[PDB]
Design an enzyme around this catalytic site. Structure first.
Site, PDB file in Angstrom:
ATOM      1  N   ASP A  35       0.828  -1.199   0.000  1.00  0.00           N
ATOM      2  CA  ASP A  35       0.000   0.000   0.000  1.00  0.00           C
ATOM      3  C   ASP A  35       0.868   1.257   0.000  1.00  0.00           C
ATOM      4  O   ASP A  35       1.361   1.672   1.047  1.00  0.00           O
ATOM      5  CB  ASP A  35      -0.914  -0.002   1.231  1.00  0.00           C
ATOM      6  CG  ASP A  35      -1.813   1.210   1.300  1.00  0.00           C
ATOM      7  OD1 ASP A  35      -1.922   1.915   0.282  1.00  0.00           O
ATOM      8  OD2 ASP A  35      -2.432   1.439   2.368  1.00  0.00           O
ATOM      9  N   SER A 199      -0.604  15.567 -12.059  1.00  0.00           N
ATOM     10  CA  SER A 199      -0.846  15.208 -13.444  1.00  0.00           C
ATOM     11  C   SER A 199      -1.092  16.468 -14.273  1.00  0.00           C
ATOM     12  O   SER A 199      -1.627  17.460 -13.781  1.00  0.00           O
ATOM     13  CB  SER A 199      -2.045  14.262 -13.525  1.00  0.00           C
ATOM     14  OG  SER A 199      -2.457  14.004 -14.858  1.00  0.00           O
TER      15      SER A 199
END
Length: 330
Positions: A35, A199
């Site tokens: 994770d 992004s």
């Protein structure tokens, strides 16, 4: 040193991925959920409340000659999906894919929430976010990667998750045969303890690319792709019959649909998520309403590039002095 381990979807939907981890001496192999959005290595154990164990493999520290109680240490964690676990702490030898760390904090669960109990395939979590998020008190502990880093050939790990197929976590090296083209690296902020990056935009299907900054986290422990409501609405508008359902808890679409791809930007590069990666199947057995793999982050407070996004790429988690993230197509 290096390590290399195969990671395997837990079910036919790729809801999560499990990776075998050797703990203790002799080894006890548990299948952990790696994770990159958390920083605790915790396991089902011989200390876990019996009624809360249902099929998981447990760690028994009393059977490990290298286990030592970390005196006074406790831990307690709550995840974004509302699940939680807590317990006490041992140090022991932990190996992943041939890479060994001695003195790793292994957090033994005394209590786990229902979602963990109900998932027999996940024996615990191995956190790979920054150690500043580790919950052990009163002395915070380091992640497996943080402990291994100095010994690694290069201070990196890579995630290569499969679509409906196994993939690989590598530590200490970049497998140049595992991706196509080049790796595009992008800046990381560690201010919130995550692999947080920005992004450069998105496209829906064959549509034009929209240049827009989307701050979010690279999180292997989250199944879906959570993005701003504007972006998510633009995606689902291209699927006839798709709608946001408050009763179901997100966007659903007719199972008869063919889903468009979704592209996200990494600098000037582009990662394309095929439409099929966005199908999470019937909302309930036999239903013709299917659950979407792109969902709104509104009210999460952060955008999350979960497995839906990451499995479309070869992803480098670069733990150099100034961390960065790399993405390549594959």
């Amino acid at each position: 040193s290096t390590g290399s381990a195969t990671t395997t979807p837990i079910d036919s939907l790729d809801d999560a991925y499990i990776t075998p981890v050797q703990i203790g001496t002799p080894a006890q192999t548990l299948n952990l959920d790696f994770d990159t959005g958390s920083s605790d290595l915790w396991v089902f154990s011989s200390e876990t409340t019996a009624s809360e164990v249902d099929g998981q493999t447990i760690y028994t520290p009393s059977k490990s000659t290298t286990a030592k109680l970390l005196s006074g240490a406790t831990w307690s964690i709550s995840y974004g999906d509302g699940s939680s676990s807590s317990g006490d702490v041992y140090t022991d030898t932990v190996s992943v894919g041939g890479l060994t760390v001695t003195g790793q904090a292994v957090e033994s669960a005394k209590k786990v929430s229902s979602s963990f109990t109900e998932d027999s395939t996940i024996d615990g979590l191995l956190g790979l976010a920054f150690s500043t998020l580790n919950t052990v008190s009163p002395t915070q502990q380091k992640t497996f990667f943080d402990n291994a880093k100095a010994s690694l050939d290069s201070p990196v790990f890579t995630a290569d998750l499969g679509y409906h197929a196994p993939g690989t976590y590598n530590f200490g090296f970049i497998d140049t045969t595992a991706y196509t083209g080049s790796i595009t690296y992008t800046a990381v902020s560690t201010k919130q303890g995550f692999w947080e990056w920005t992004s450069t935009g998105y496209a829906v299907g064959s549509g034009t690319f929209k240049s827009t900054s989307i701050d979010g986290i690279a999180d292997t422990g989250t199944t879906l792709l959570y993005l701003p409501a504007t972006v998510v609405s633009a995606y689902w508008a291209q699927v006839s019959g798709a709608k946001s359902s408050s009763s179901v808890g997100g966007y659903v679409f007719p199972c008869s649909a063919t889903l468009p791809s979704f592209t996200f930007g990494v600098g000037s590069a582009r990662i394309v998520i095929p439409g099929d990666y966005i199908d999470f199947g019937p909302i309930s057995t036999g239903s013709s309403s299917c659950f979407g793999g792109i969902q709104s982050s509104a009210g999460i407070g952060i955008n999350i590039f979960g497995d839906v996004a990451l499995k479309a790429a070869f992803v480098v988690f670069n733990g150099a002095t100034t961390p960065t993230l790399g993405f390549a197509s594959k």
